[PDB]
Design a protein around this nucleic acid. Sequence first.
DNA 1: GGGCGGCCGCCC
DNA 2: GGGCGGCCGCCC
Lengths: 83, 99
Amino acid sequence: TVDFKAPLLPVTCGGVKGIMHKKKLQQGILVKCIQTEDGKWFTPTEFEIKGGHARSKNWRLSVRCGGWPLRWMMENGFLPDPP
Amino acid sequence: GPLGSDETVDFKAPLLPVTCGGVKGIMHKKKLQQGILVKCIQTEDGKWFTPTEFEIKGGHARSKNWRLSVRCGGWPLRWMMENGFLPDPPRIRYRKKKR
DNA sequence: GGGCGGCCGCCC
DNA sequence: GGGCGGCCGCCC
């Protein structure tokens, strides 16, 4: 279940599940903000690689929330776009 | 279905009437040849668009392929290219140096 | 290095 | 014909 407004977002990338912490993402892409079910932590690009999508080189499209690319979440005000 | 419309259009002219959705514009072949990021399509209000900008203006952003969503005489621009009526624009506006 | 636009094959 | 995901290279 997905609440777009929640501080924690369930995300997927190539079938790998994670939990994204918006507060950590807001600190910039060098901060690990996505935690997988074994407790490990990933930056957005690291999670893109983890999900098999290294070649796409765009975590904003490769990482999904409820099936939506994170880019769509940013476009609709649900997720900060890190500067 | 896949064919063009019934209007007469000269496919060899330097300026082509193009359409995307309901939106009409004029494509300047000489500008398209310069590179894909060059504004080459002028709408009637005078505003200018690149091919992908024109696709978005025409309501076809989701298509992500101006070669099929932009038309001339009903024909997709891909058909115009396949038959030598339209150049395929370069990605960049200069010749790459030996690498 | 990273953002992001362009290409186009594959699906529906 | 609408749709969109995988891939990659241009450039800030």
